[PDB]
Amino acid sequence: AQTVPYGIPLIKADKVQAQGFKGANVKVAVLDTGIQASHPDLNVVGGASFVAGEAYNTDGNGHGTHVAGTVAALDNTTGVLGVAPSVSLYAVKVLNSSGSGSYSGIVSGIEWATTNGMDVINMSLGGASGSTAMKQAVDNAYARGVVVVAAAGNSGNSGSTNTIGYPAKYDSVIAVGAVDSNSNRASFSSVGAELEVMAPGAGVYSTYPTNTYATLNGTXMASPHVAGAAALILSKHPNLSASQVRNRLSSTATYLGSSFYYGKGLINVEAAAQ
Ligand SMILES: [Ca+2]
Ligand SMILES: [Ca+2]
């Protein structure tokens, strides 16, 4: 029997999936530690590794397989259900088993995904600094029509300190914060002027290496929900631009409070797909 995580109904993705739009023919690339491709509730159609020694179809850490399950775990009678269970899923391995990569590795992942025509890029990762080539790669991606989503960061609120990290801090990247099952800001969610929307990030249940399932906490769990919401909108309205997908998501968000803490608010993909 399949479990539906609380996140899928809280962002109303089940409402859109019942209308018949499940993400078919949208290509989503997960830039992360890889994906365990043999996992029975995941279908990975391809990908690339910029980690020497490792292929994309292995996840030595866990983080990548979890983030992918939240975007695309298959709608069946097994494990969990993703936000866009019919997308074409691509694994781009830019982080190692330890969950560390260099800026160049990440940049070659972004570049590979823009060049292989992904509709949506998810980066559940954040550095303390940017990089000129990283700014150019996401600006490039977004100018080519790719929706670019990343985790705002898990640095919490500190007075009026802007704690949003990179690539989220760039203007061509949707910075995603974290709420819990009661729609409260998760204490670790970064704050700052660039925070755009919030999604489920506390206690998220999803696929995990080796044919199992796990609960993790992070804006890194919040981000795949928005990458999945974009995929649903695009399988329903397939000639929209990336700024049109981006604009449906923040203009229809449910207001939760001050933008420093919440951005435009909690996404509602039913309202955004209308
Ligand atoms: Ca399933
Ligand atoms: Ca941004």
Curated annotation (Swiss-Prot):
Name the Enzyme Commission number(s) assigned to this protein.
3.4.21.62
Principal localization reads secreted
What is annotated as the active site?
A: 32 (charge relay system), 63 (charge relay system), 220 (charge relay system)
Q: Which residues form the Peptidase S8 domain?
A: 5-273
The reactions it catalyses are:
Hydrolysis of proteins with broad specificity for peptide bonds, and a preference for a large uncharged residue in P1. Hydrolyzes peptide amides
Give the enzyme class: hydrolase
One GO BP annotation is:
proteolysis
What domain of life does the UniProt record list for this protein's source?
A: Bacteria
Cofactor mode of binding and number, as noted: Binds 2 calcium ions per subunit.
Assigned keywords, A-Z: Calcium, Hydrolase, Metal-binding, Protease, Secreted, Serine protease, Signal, Zymogen
Q: Which GO terms describe its molecular function?
A: metal ion binding; serine-type endopeptidase activity
Task: Spell out how it gets used.
Answer: Used as a detergent protease. Sold under the name Alcalase by Novozymes.
Activity regulation behaviour? Inhibited by p-chlorophenyl and 1-naphthyl boronic acid derivatives.
The compartments listed are: Secreted
List ligand-binding residues for Ca(2+) 2. Answer: 168, 170, 173
Q: Which GO terms describe its cellular component?
A: extracellular space
- Kindly list the cofactors needed: Ca(2+)
Give the binding site residues for Ca(2+) 1.
2, 41, 74, 76, 78, 80
**What family is this?**
Belongs to the peptidase S8 family.
Chain's role: Subtilisin is an extracellular alkaline serine protease, it catalyzes the hydrolysis of proteins and peptide amides. Shows high specificity for aromatic and hydrophobic amino acids in the P1 substrate position. May play an important role in the degradation of feather keratin.
| UniProt name for this protein | Subtilisin Carlsberg
Q: Which gene encodes it?
A: subC
Q: From which residue to which, out of the full length, is covered? A: 106 to 379 of 379
